[PDB]
């Protein structure tokens, strides 16, 4: 059913899933539609190019929306198949391969903001005995809070499967020092109900 | 002007029964089915209004509710006030409206003509 039931992200998003993700009319529509709302949701000043983090970038659809709006970014992803499709689309920003559960490898105080479109909920399940959801969520938000500059904002779009994953993400988020809230657009609809973690440092 | 390759002047000479083939299939059926007393009386009133009018301006306006009566070729130049349910639309019958009805020149409806949260704390 849901893509997270398939297995680990490095094996589910293989070469054949990467192709049909690119030529997916619903995906091209809504991934950029949410990135428009998510870029607007971090209240960054206009007429000022910023340096952003595209965590879980994948094909680079959300990466291309920043570059068309005059920003610069770097993307971090775990599967090489979605990264290979990003190279073939001739994107502008830099690409990084790694797991966000193991930490974001940048110096403290680097990015003016962090953008996240449907990557977060892949940490609530652990498909290895070495992996723990609580420590992988904390290692993400603690490293995110270090790397993000003070006063900046991180907006996170995620697809929870029940109320417990919203809770278990939130407590790990607020334990790393973030303050903010949950933005739910159309909170009582079905197709347009999108969840947005708005997080900012003071 | 030509209508189906027939000019206006002999079209006015032309009677009803050989107007059958110059119209379309809808108007050909309607003319076979006949014209009721309501539109015979109206055609006389346009004929009367064209009779007494000065020969160098348009005649007076004739107000009617007959939206379903096709435009015969002798109706050209007339002033018909056609009613959409609210007001009377004054339409001047050009010779290019022969096969058409009267109801579609008085439109009964109007066209339709049809800010995001950002958290501070």
């Amino acid at each position: 059913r849901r893509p997270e039931h398939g297995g680990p992200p490095e094996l589910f998003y293989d070469e054949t899933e990467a192709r049909k993700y690119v030529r997916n009319s619903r995906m091209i529509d809504i991934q950029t539609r949410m990135a428009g709302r998510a870029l607007e949701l971090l209240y960054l000043p206009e007429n000022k190019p910023c340096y952003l983090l595209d965590i879980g970038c994948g094909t680079g659809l959300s990466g291309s929306y920043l570059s068309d709006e005059g920003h610069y970014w770097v993307g971090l992803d775990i599967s090489p198949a979605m990264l290979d499709e990003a190279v073939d689309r001739e994107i502008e920003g830099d690409l990084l391969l790694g797991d966000m559960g193991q930490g974001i490898p940048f110096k403290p105080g680097t990015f003016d903001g962090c953008i996240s479109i449907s990557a977060v909920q892949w940490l609530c399940n652990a498909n290895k005995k070495s992996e723990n959801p609580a420590k992988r969520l904390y290692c993400f938000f603690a490293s995110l809070f270090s790397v993000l500059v003070r006063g900046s904002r991180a907006v996170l779009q995620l697809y929870p499967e029940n109320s417990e994953q919203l809770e278990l993400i939130t407590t790990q988020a607020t334990k790393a020092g973030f303050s903010g809230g949950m933005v739910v657009d159309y909170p009582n609809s079905a197709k347009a109900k999108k969840f947005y973690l708005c997080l900012f440092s003071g | 002007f030509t209508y189906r390759g027939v000019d206006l002047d002999q079209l006015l000479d032309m009677s009803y029964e050989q107007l059958m083939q110059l119209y379309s299939a809808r108007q050909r059926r309607r003319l076979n089915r006949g014209l009721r007393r309501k539109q015979h009386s109206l055609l006389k009133r346009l004929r009367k209004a064209k009779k007494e009018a000065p020969p160098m301006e348009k005649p007076e306006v004739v107000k009617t509710h007959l939206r379903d009566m096709i435009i015969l070729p002798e109706m050209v130049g007339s002033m018909v006030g056609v009613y959409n349910g609210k007001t009377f639309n004054q339409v001047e019958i050009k010779p290019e409206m022969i096969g058409h009805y009267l109801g579609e020149f008085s439109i009964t409806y109007k066209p339709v003509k049809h800010s995001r949260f950002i958290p501070l704390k």
Partner: peptide, 29 residues
């Protein structure tokens, strides 16, 4: 949690004129 945007006569979401397009904000702890 977005109760002011709820449509009474129909399941869905109805806009308001004073407030922005429908949403719900809940703060953290």
């Amino acid at each position: 949690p977005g109760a002011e945007y709820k449509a009474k006569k129909a399941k869905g979401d109805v806009k308001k004129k004073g407030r922005p397009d429908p949403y719900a904000y809940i703060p953290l702890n």
